[model samples]
Target: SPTAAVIAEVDELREKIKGSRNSFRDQSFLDQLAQHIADAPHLGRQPIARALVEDLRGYASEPRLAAVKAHINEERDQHIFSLFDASYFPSLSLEYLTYETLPTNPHLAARYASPTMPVNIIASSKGFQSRVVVALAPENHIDGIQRGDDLIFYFINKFVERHNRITRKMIDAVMAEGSFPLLRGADDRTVEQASSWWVRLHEYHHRQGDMPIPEFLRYKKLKPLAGLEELRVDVSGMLVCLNDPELPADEARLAYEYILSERLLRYAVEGIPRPNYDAVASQLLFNYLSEHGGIELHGGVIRLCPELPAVLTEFLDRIQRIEQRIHTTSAEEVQQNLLEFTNRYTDYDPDAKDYRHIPFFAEIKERLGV
Candidate 1:
């Protein structure tokens, strides 16, 4: 019975230790902390100072720890006063977790993780690294959204807004249709909300192994690698959406069409000079379509290839080959694979646009008999 009680207490502690939304800066906690600072200033700052000191130990003077703690204590008054404004200065309600060592990779920071999640590296026996999940603010989309949902919603809005502003005119001028109907029909918010829910169900298929699906480790330059990752995720996201009962078949088609439209329009906007890795990824998708008899570019007007779902399934299979190589191959081989993928899909000067290299557009034009 004593052993059972001990096991039960351990389980309770583990539950409490799980990652959670930030409630640390709430009024109650702040008031308690302020009281500690007043009653025992050194004691109040010790725990905080210990972690900070451990991190800074090799880089700075040990004596500086006291000075840092003193400064923090002085600043505590600012938070204490803010705490008085209770309702106005509520703590972060967003899910928040800390890492012992924040990733320094720019691509990891920009592409993978949430921009709002704070990264502070400090020593703590209590801290544990964990996978991240993000959802759009309830105000942004629907409530109770999940990890991939925010990603899809954010990108859908991004794609629609950016394309309309940058390339809608070009598309209309070239297509002879007078207006871009593909981009019309539904408002951005409506599509984004619906698509986000679809992405939520889609993430379940990620099949996270012992390691996180995205370990956020250091990698070669981002261009092709970043693009490859995006395309893989997008292809898989669409596949999952196609099977789900919650998302209407029409909406699923619309979402995929919008994604493909954005990719096609990028050529009109950035053309041959753009060095974007994401664009390179888009080109790869376009090439896949061309090879599969699913695309036609006639007289500057691009037509979607028929049977996109089948074509996408094929791309998914090919992309998985690339994904497998990323983990199984040597570092040099991985970089080599990235180079070859980019080269096969794009002729943009690996070095600079000023140089003459035949890009994938040339191939598409040749295929279209332009």
Candidate 2:
């Protein structure tokens, strides 16, 4: 009954979120930056730092907003600092571009630039449309670019492209039925767009309030644990979407199918360093669904079972209990619990060392003149 009540509250919150929103044009700071960049080509050509303090002077008056901007730059500096050894190789520069100035090249669009997911803040009129940071190749073409730098992006784009193709094919099959009502566009892109919308609501559920990160987990190099956080957020989002009645059945079905396909992609990518936390979580979700008759798979095809909602509700309840333990219980206890959970779906040996050979990482380091 308590779980049912919580779900009901979440549904109400979802409606509140859809209703209380702000227009992107309301942000004076962003508007000024876009206007200034258009007015002066030379300023746009300057380093991202130059545009921040000098070119974008409108936000300087807002003390809190200015601090937030400074904090973002500070984080960027840390990232730049980490690549000190790679600095000689035509240093990468970060810049914000409006939709008009956004890169047209596919490589730059997928790898270097993309839209950011929005956040839900109660009582705050500010609605962020999208946010993304593009990492650029250095100017003046030097031979210093390393394989290690591009390897991650290469795989990321590859996975996304493949996933989109698979999702589109699946959506087309669903549409071919000709029985379902089309609440949205018939285009393949709308299927992915629906999934993206589902994701926003799912993320908002996770960030419903200021849930503090565990002290031990804060800023730590706990990749395994980091995977758990992602897994929780993703599963929570999926569960929320599945339960929402306002969401059309077809749209929800498409979103579920997309998630399954995306999980397969994650599984493929996370294979090398042992199955990652997200992979483990995905496996757990699939396994539980299968065991409970909530999903059926045959010959590489997945069928969402009738008992899916019941299974998801129970799964959500179980995870919430674990999360509560982590919130109030000991950090070590929670970490151990997560490792045990992950182990159920993966041979994740915490003791084992897994090293990946990134091309030119060592070579570039050696080339860095002392």
Predicted structure with the largest lDDT when compared to the true one: 1
Tens digits of per-residue lDDT for model 1 on 24-60? Answer: 3244533343353333323223343333323233222
Candidate 2: which pairs clash? 116-131
- Tell me how far the alpha carbon of residue 187 in candidate 2 is from the true structure, in angstroms, after superposition: 2.9
After superposition, the stretches of candidate 2 with alpha carbons farther than 4 Å from their true spots are 1-41, 45-51, 55-92, 100-162, 165-188, 208-221, 248-250, 264-273, 297-301, 350-370
lDDT of 2 by residue, 18-85 (tens): 42223211346345434544344343333433434342344334422232233333333211101111
Tell me how far the alpha carbon of residue 284 in candidate 1 is from the true structure, in angstroms, after superposition. Answer: 2.0
**Model 2, residue 233: C-alpha shift (Å):** 2.1
